[PDB]
Write a structure and sequence with these properties.
0% of the residues lie in helices and 35% in strands. The protein is an all-beta fold. It has one domain: Trefoil (Acidic Fibroblast Growth Factor, subunit A) (Trefoil). The strands form 5 sheets. A 3-stranded antiparallel beta sheet has the order 1-4-5, with no helix packed on it. Strands 2-3 form a two-stranded antiparallel ribbon. Strand 4 and strand 5 form a beta hairpin. This is Glycoside hydrolase family 18.
Amino acid sequence: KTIWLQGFNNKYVNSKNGQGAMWCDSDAPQAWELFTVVDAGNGKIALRGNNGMYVSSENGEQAITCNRPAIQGWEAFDWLETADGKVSLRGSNGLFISSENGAAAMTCTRPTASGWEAFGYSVV
């Protein structure tokens, strides 16, 4: 299934076509804002961006990216949802992807999920 991800700032997660760090900075979802939800095994998922690569948590040591050709330790996430159907994505470190409210590159550094880590989504 293929989705967009709308952050707390009402902008959309952007793969940046694998060129550097991801940002939640797009006004509307188009090609670079679409991610295919792939089964990563053991009930986890990976997110494949427009460039065919996978989103990586980068161990929470730097901003997340969409440049890996394989699911190799930092690319598997738990899909966790709020009551109204927003999604939070928990990485290998147990930490959540954050939109950072769009004023910084997206990270996977936070151990709890609030607004900045909650994303609206639908299936395309």
